[PDB]
């Protein structure tokens, strides 16, 4: 059956080791982990992605889809971005989805789906682009606005994210909204909003899996 790797972005807790350089997959290095952002009230990105990721896991499991998580808690150091990608590749999953939230200007809001471009392998060139497009349509269908300050119509093909560069299986990274925006943060800070994000995410994952 289907297997999905879920990466709730960032760590449950950080230490100085997050500054260690790790490969990007395109030659250079970047920091092992970014700390992540937060809403104005202090709700951290790492907890938003963890709590939303658990709802996504529950939804996929309800469909009979086996899941794996990149980290097992929201209160301790987790793996660096290169390790998370190597872990995902070792599982050989049918899809990989990373969950993040952005820290942008307060008036900008909405989601963007990131994918590796230019592609480094045939999966990145084809299936992952299709996965990104399906996911963008699904978030829009849940009434999550496409970001009005970054990407293009809810999509962002890019070369600078190590986890996307290193993937050998279909992989996307979803920035679900801007934590600094009043409307997005109200969604993120509510259990009902996190469930609505997870509903969009599961429909995007299932839609992509059903085409493969
Ligand atoms: I570990 C990952 C997995 C899937 C998609 C993207 C990523 C990522 N890229 N940069 N940080 N995280
Ligand atoms: Zn992030």
């Amino acid at each position: 059956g289907m297997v999905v790797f879920i990466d709730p972005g960032h760590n449950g807790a950080n230490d100085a080791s997050i500054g260690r350089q790790v490969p990007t997959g395109r030659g250079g290095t970047k920091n092992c982990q970014a700390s992540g952002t937060s809403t104005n009230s202090g709700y951290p990105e790492h907890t938003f992605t963890w709590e939303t990721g658990l709802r996504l896991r529950a939804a996929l499991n309800a469909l009979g889809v086996r899941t794996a998580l990149s980290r097992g808690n929201d209160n301790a150091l987790g793996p660096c971005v290169d390790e998370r990608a190597n872990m995902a590749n070792a599982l050989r999953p049918n899809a990989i989805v990373s969950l993040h939230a952005d820290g942008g200007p307060a008036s900008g809001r909405g989601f963007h789906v990131n994918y590796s471009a230019p592609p480094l392998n045939a999966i990145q060139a084809g299936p992952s682009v299709q996965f990104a497009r399906i996911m963008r349509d699904q978030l829009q269908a849940s009434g999550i606005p496409k970001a009005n300050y970054i990407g293009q119509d809810g999509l962002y093909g890019r070369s600078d994210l190590a986890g996307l560069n290193l993937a050998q299986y279909p992989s996307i990274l979803v920035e679900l909204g801007n934590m600094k925006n009043p409307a997005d943060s109200a969604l993120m800070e509510s259990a009902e909003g996190r469930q609505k994000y997870a509903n969009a995410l599961v429909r995007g994952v299932a839609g992509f899996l059903a085409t493969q």
Side-chain angles (χ1 to χ4, degrees), residues 52-120:
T52 305
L54 290 184
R55 299 317 308 155
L56 175 56
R57 174 161 87 165
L60 286 166
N61 291 347
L63 287 189
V65 177
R66 179 153 56 101
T67 57
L69 298 176
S70 64
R71 58 180 166 117
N73 65 69
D74 191 45
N75 58 23
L77 190 71
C80 301
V81 293
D82 63 327
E83 183 178 3
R84 295 180 189 209
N86 286 317
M87 290 166 58
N89 288 337
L91 174 62
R92 314 173 76 86
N94 302 88
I96 301 162
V97 52
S98 176
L99 305 182
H100 282 254
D102 197 24
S107 72
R109 80 165 298 205
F111 74 85
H112 62 289
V113 182
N114 302 273
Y115 62 96
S116 179
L120 296 175

Side-chain angles (χ1 to χ4, degrees), residues 4-9 39 43-61 67-71 73-74 97-102 111 135 139 142 144 174-177 179 184-203 205:
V4 173
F5 187 94
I6 303 168
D7 169 38
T39 71
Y43 183 53
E45 183 184 354
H46 72 83
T47 301
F48 166 66
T49 65
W50 177 251
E51 296 180 332
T52 305
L54 290 184
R55 299 317 308 155
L56 175 56
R57 174 161 87 165
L60 286 166
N61 291 347
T67 57
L69 298 176
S70 64
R71 58 180 166 117
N73 65 69
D74 191 45
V97 52
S98 176
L99 305 182
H100 282 254
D102 197 24
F111 74 85
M135 191 49 87
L139 289 155
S142 283
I144 305 309
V174 182
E175 290 280 1
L176 288 159
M179 301 205 91
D184 282 353
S185 63
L187 296 174
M188 296 156 178
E189 289 168 8
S190 62
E192 325 74 56
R194 293 186 295 270
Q195 185 65 56
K196 169 158 64 73
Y197 286 129
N199 294 344
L201 288 162
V202 77
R203 292 157 202 181
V205 174

Side-chain angles (χ1 to χ4, degrees), residues 9-22:
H10 302 283
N11 287 330
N14 290 313
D15 66 20
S17 74
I18 70 165
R20 183 176 55 85
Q21 292 310 285
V22 304

